[PDB]
């Protein structure tokens, strides 16, 4: 637990990628249901969520050429959500728009470091590997299914003037009783329609997130249910199949419902290789980054890890000596952490370099190594 | 691929709006009533109302206002539909032929815009200079009322006030001026804006913005000589006319929120006000300038959806929750202290929350028992075909579910009543109802922090055993505290010859968003007393229960469970199925099970008796609000979804690919125009081109019937529909395909797999030349069989004989 004085804005900056990159302010969004021909990055194996910051380091000449071509055009590439990545099977995905880039000379080879952000979900229609070896994807933009209020079709016109509204539990009781009154016209009561109300689910998830982060919901958390749902999904430490099932969801209400069901059910995080070795619990999860408790970071050899920060973790051995080289969190030294039983890499133990920092130590576990578990 | 036929058996009885004016003649006083898709025109006589016209439109009437511009001899009628079809109509009668001609029409929907929370608002400027529409937030649509605007062209003006609650056109203004109540982070205020047609913009209003009540909801434009505007909230009634600011806070209106009004005197001296609890108050304006405001409780009527003053103290009260009324007001109060005397009552079946089919009287002749109304307007309705004879049994509390038990010759009905918190420690009912005036009553045994509050309403749920002959409330069993009953079934289980009443419940608490505790209670009714035979505790809400081949199929949140009835008269779990969704809707046919979610998440399972579990057959996830589901046959499933639509999904048993065998193909879409609440298998005609019979009850009291057809008959009736649409003049000139098209704000597709039975039945009313036009130049035998007018008359008569 304890208190924090680290400054949560530093991990989001990805300062380990060197000096200040060239930043882009323009935004390119394609119309819904429209088809686009987007290039696919060959070495990206992550299941990207819209709004999630993705850092990359590319040194292959083909990758650097493709990145230059994208920077010269719309700065958008396709990140395939692979169901079976060994055979490179992909049915869904998410676009990523490059918002920062930096090519570095005085270097052994031409290398480019990139910060992009997920934008639009999509369904993969066609995959064609070009003669260059790089592959293109003919892609259909998936639309955000926004459904109206469940009372809109069963609303009394005389009560239309009562639908605008000016101890939180009493406030929510009054909200439920006033917004879903006309539920007495249907076969279902008010408290059932509350289970499908965007704001009620958003407030329950806000409570569950207040359990994790001390940043107030006044500013950090978005108000739109779609953006809120994507922000929550970007920081949920779940396996790849559950994340794929969550990306397939098009309606924000279903997304929030599934997210709160996950937050209620899965309470332990075990080793994926062990399945029977508890590593941490939901209670030790804490947010050290503005993007939440879990964020995507890139390492010196090009691998992207979704790191979830926790205060404590058990059943882990520490390999090697601590190092500050290319550390994802400035001011902390990492130490490789393996499972006590199967020796699989679970994450790193980050220890503060200065004695005045808090927390003095924490754990960053990679999402690909964890498995959620219900007791 | 679906081939279905849907037809209306009872037109909507709920009243959503009523106006008075001079529409048929300048000397006649006309009363116009809107019943969703129906428009009724009456002439106000000394005795009462003389019916002069009834028409049907291809839309849901959202705005209905009369207005008389300069030069017109009598009033015109402006009508806007739910699909944003606006029109201006005029009454025309020559001898006996009455025709509602269309003076103007057009679609006012914008390509971009979010529909407002307060819904559609339609106002007309007093001097008939323009029509104002409030459809989307931040935009005000203006339709200039010139003589050349037959297409009803309109332009939008930007609104800095994004959350407008109510708006009215003020009287006595040189320029058309609107006065509206809006809300901002500072609170609720009232503002005014002049509408410039030359600039097509807004100009500063006559008086500055005033800070009003936090619950200011209603705006009333006072006519001359008073002028100004009255703002009505939950606690205060204010009046603003430039320098004139008059606020009153009568406590008699603090009990309930006033939701409707109507002008009595043409100069605006007296007004009628109706609250949510059915109370009718009189607002008096004392006088060049306004002297004072006064509120007098006139009495109690039905829960008023709309009020209108006719003449000679006669007032029409249009109600959707209950029967409509014609009431008489008197100068002197009676013996109980109420100036209101009920003259006449008009049946209203809305809302229909549940229903069932019973052969009460003559065997073979079916009757329909429905749970209608809500609160003190709750009742049971017994409907049979003679057009339709309806018997009413008032309950004075809200009915929710119903089922029939033949062996005991009685009905089981789930009901709920509202009670206020007691001053000491408990709850007190607001009025005597069926649950409190039963010949016998009982309560449940057993198996809450921050208790009670200050006079806050609480729902008390009861099971009512009602005799099928006399309809006396034989028994009224009350459930536990904080217990909500959801499902009800009457059936025999296992080898037990007794027929039981099974009720599924849920424990609801304010701290729990989702119920984690519930009951399945098994009662037996015999010798005029209800006893609890069995009781099972489940870890969730029992949303639905179904008799499944001598077993009990229950839906406990996300789980579908099968119970067996033991010899010790206990419920034994046989098998479970854990789903990705919460099992809201449960239906069965043989060994097939249909599971449904509020967001159109459909699942089809099959019971494997040799293995003793459930096996997934198919599913379909398309997010859209639902309301009711039913199984048409082994392969077809009917449902009602968002925006008053019906749909039919189909499976392929044999099929070709196991990946395709697990998908339910959407084979039918239709725009009904009603919000269906209940589907049930049954028919009302004495026991053919049609196969099956599924009745459905809706919110506006409309009752419908759906049946299945063959491919040849479906194609023939589709061609007939196209021809009839080509020949029939629509009121407001609304396209039939546009009205029947599956309409949501996300998508709009043409209707498929459905035959509009009302359109086909309208073929018998047109003239013989129109019949020959339709049958002009028209595949069961394998080739091409010709068709004359008499053949189609016989076909349509045979199709009408099914309802």
């Amino acid at each position: 637990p304890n208190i924090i004085n680290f400054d949560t804005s530093l991990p989001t900056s990805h300062t380990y990628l060197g000096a200040d990159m060239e930043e882009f302010h323009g935004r390119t969004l394609h119309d819904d249901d429209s088809c686009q021909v987007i290039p696919v990055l060959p070495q990206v194996m992550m299941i990207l969520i819209p709004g999630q910051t993705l850092p990359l380091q590319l040194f292959h000449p083909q990758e650097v050429s493709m990145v230059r071509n994208l920077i010269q055009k719309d700065r958008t590439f396709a990140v395939l959500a692979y169901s079976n990545v060994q055979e490179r099977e992909a049915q869904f995905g998410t676009t990523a728009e490059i918002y920062a880039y930096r090519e570095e000379q005085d270097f052994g080879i031409e290398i480019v470091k990139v910060k992009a952000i997920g934008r639009q979900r999509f369904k993969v229609l066609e995959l064609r590997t070009q003669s260059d070896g790089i592959q293109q994807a003919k892609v259909q933009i998936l639309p955000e299914c926004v459904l109206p209020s469940t009372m809109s079709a069963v609303q009394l016109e005389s009560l239309n003037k009562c639908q605008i509204f000016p101890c939180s539990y009493k406030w929510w009781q009054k909200y439920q009783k006033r917004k879903f009154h006309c539920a007495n016209l249907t076969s279902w009561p008010r408290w059932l329609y509350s289970l499908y109300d965007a704001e009620t689910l958003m407030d329950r998830i806000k409570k569950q997130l207040r359990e994790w982060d001390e940043n107030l919901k006044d500013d950090s958390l978005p108000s739109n249910p779609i953006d809120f749902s994507y922000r929550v999904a970007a920081c949920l430490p779940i396996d790849d199949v559950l994340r794929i099932q969550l990306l397939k969801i098009g309606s924000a209400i279903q997304r929030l419902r599934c997210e709160l069901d996950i937050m209620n059910k899965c309470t332990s995080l075990c080793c994926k290789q062990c399945q029977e070795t508890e590593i941490t619990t939901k209670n030790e999860i804490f947010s050290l980054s503005l993007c939440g408790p879990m964020a995507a970071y890139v390492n010196p050899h090009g691998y992207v890890h979704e790191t979830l920060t926790v205060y404590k973790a058990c059943n882990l051995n520490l390999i090697g000596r601590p190092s500050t080289e290319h550390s994802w969190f400035p001011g902390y030294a990492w130490t490789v952490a393996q499972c006590k039983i199967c020796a699989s890499h679970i994450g790193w133990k980050f220890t503060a370099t200065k004695k005045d920092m808090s927390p003095q130590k924490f754990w960053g576990l990679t999402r690909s190594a964890l498995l959620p578990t219900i007791p | 691929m679906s081939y279905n036929y849907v037809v209306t058996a009872q037109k909507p009885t709920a009243v959503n709006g009523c106006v008075t004016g001079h529409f048929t003649s300048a000397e006649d006083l006309n009363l116009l009533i809107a019943k969703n898709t129906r428009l009724e025109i009456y002439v106000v006589t000394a005795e009462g109302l003389r019916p002069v016209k009834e028409v049907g439109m291809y839309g849901k009437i959202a705005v209905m206002e009369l207005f008389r511009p300069k030069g017109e001899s009598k009033d015109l009628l402006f009508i806007l539909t739910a699909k944003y079809n606006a029109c201006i109509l005029e009454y025309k009668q020559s001898g006996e032929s009455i025709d509602i001609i269309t003076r103007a029409h057009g679609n006012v929907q914008d390509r971009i815009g979010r529909p407002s929370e307060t819904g559609i608002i339609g106002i007309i400027d007093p001097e008939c200079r323009m029509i104002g529409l409030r459809l989307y937030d931040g935009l005000f649509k203006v339709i200039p009322l010139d003589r050349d605007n037959k297409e009803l062209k309109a332009f939008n003006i930007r609104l800095e006030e994004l959350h407008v609650i109510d708006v009215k056109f003020l009287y006595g203004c040189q320029a058309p001026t609107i006065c509206f109540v809006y809300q901002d982070p500072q609170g609720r205020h009232v503002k005014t804006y002049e509408v410039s047609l030359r600039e097509k913009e807004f100009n500063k209003g006559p008086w500055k913005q005033e800070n009003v009540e936090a619950e200011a909801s209603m705006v009333i434009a006072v006519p001359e000589p008073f002028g100004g505007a009255i703002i009505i909230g939950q606690e205060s009634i204010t009046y603003h006319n430039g320098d004139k600011y008059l606020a009153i806070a009568p406590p008699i209106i603090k009990q309930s929120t006033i939701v409707c009004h109507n002008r009595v005197d043409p100069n605006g001296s007296r007004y009628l006000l109706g609250d949510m609890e059915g109370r009718l108050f009189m607002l008096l304006l004392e006088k060049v300038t306004l002297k004072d405001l006064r509120v007098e409780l006139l009495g109690e009527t039905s829960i008023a959806e709309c009020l209108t003053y006719l003449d000679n103290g006669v007032v029409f009260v249009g109600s959707r929750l209950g029967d409509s009324q014609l009431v008489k007001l008197n100068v002197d109060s009676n013996e109980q202290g109420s100036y209101v005397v009920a003259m006449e009552t008009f049946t209203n079946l809305g809302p229909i929350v549940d229903m069932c089919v019973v052969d009460l009287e003559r065997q073979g002749q079916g009757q329909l028992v429905t749970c209608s109304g809500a609160f003190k307007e709750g009742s049971l309705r017994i409907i049979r075909n003679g057009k339709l004879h309806i018997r009413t049994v008032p309950l004075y509390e809200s009915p929710r579910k119903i089922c029939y038990q033949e062996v005991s010759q009685c009905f089981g009905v789930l009901s709920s009543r509202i009670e206020v918190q007691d001053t000491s420690g408990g709850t007190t009912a607001l009025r005597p109802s069926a649950s409190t005036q039963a010949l016998s009553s009982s309560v449940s045994s057993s198996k809450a922090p921050h208790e009670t509050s200050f006079g806050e309403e609480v729902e008390v749920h009861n099971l009512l055993i009602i005799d099928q002959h006399t309809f006396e409330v034989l028994h009224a069993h009350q459930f536990l505290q904080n217990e909500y009953a959801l499902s009800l079934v009457s059936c025999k289980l296992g080898k037990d010859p007794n027929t039981y009443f099974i009720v599924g419940t849920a424990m609801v608490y304010p701290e729990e968003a989702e119920p984690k505790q519930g009951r399945i209670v098994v009662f037996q009714y015999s010798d005029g007393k209800l006893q609890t035979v069995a009781e099972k505790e489940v870890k969730g809400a029992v949303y639905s229960m179904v008799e499944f081949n001598g077993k009990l199929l229950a839906s406990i949140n996300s789980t579908v469970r099968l119970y067996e009835w033991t010899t010790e008269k206990e419920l034994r779990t046989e098998c479970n199925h854990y789903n990705n969704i919460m099992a809201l809707y449960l239906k069965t046919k043989g060994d097939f099970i249909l599971v449904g979610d509020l967001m159109r998440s459909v699942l089809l399972l099959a019971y494997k008796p040799m293995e003793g579990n459930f096996e997934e057959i198919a599913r379909d996830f398309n997010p859209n609000w639902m309301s009711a589901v039913e199984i048409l046959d082994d392969d077809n499933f009917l449902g009602a979804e968002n925006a008053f639509n019906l749909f039919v999904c189909q499976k392929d048993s044999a099929a070709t690919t196991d990946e395709e065998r697990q998908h339910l193909q959407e084979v039918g879409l239709f725009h009904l125009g009603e919000f269906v609440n209940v589907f049930c298998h049954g028919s009302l005609v004495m026991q053919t081109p049609t196969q099956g019979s599924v009745l459905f009850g809706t919110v506006n009291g409309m009752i419908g019937l759906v049946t299945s057809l063959s491919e040849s008959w479906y194609n023939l009736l589709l061609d007939m529909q196209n021809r009839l649409n080509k020949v029939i003049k629509s009121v407001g000139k609304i396209e039939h395909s546009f009205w029947r098209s599956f309409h949501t704000e996300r998508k709009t597709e043409p209707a498929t797999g459905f035959i509009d039975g009302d359109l086909i039945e309208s073929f018998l009313d047109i003239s013989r030349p129109k019949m020959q036009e339709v049958v002009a130049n028209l595949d069961g035998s394998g080739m091409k069989r010709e068709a004359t007018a008499d053949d189609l008359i016989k076909v349509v008569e045979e199709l009408t004989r099914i309802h």
């Binding site: 040194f59 270097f107 052994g108 080879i109 010196p300 090009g302 080289e325 | -």
Partner: protein
């Protein structure tokens, strides 16, 4: 699973000196390559057991890594710059021999060799 002992770095019988070339190779070249972000695979002998590469020391007959070169420079194991340059070249050549063109480690070794050659062209004259 031989994984032999690392190459020797100290020899008391071996004479030592601080040539200008070797002090440049240590203070500039090795310090530049050691802090590079692609240096880590070469900072220690190849652990053929943990990497599951039983054929590595059957193909690579002259193992070499930057940790060995660092310890040899710090212990003054070399007599002249040619030995250290040959050790670097042996490391790079071993990396290219065992792996395949286009592999990630091959590109990393190519980058390091390019930077090494660009630093070695400024080798100072002996004092």
């Amino acid at each position: 699973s031989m994984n032999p002992p690392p190459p020797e770095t100290s020899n008391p019988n071996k004479p030592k000196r601080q040539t200008n070339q070797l002090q440049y190779l240590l203070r500039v070249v090795l310090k530049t390559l050691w802090k590079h972000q692609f240096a880590w695979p070469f900072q220690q002998p190849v652990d053929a057991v943990k990497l599951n590469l039983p054929d590595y020391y059957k193909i690579i007959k002259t193992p070499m890594d930057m940790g060995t070169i660092k310890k040899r420079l710090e212990n003054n194991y070399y007599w002249n710059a040619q030995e250290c340059i040959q050790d670097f070249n042996t490391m790079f050549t071993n990396c290219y021999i065992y792996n395949k063109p286009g592999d990630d480690i091959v590109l990393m070794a190519e980058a390091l060799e390019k930077l090494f050659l660009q630093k070695i062209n400024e080798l100072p004259t002996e004092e």
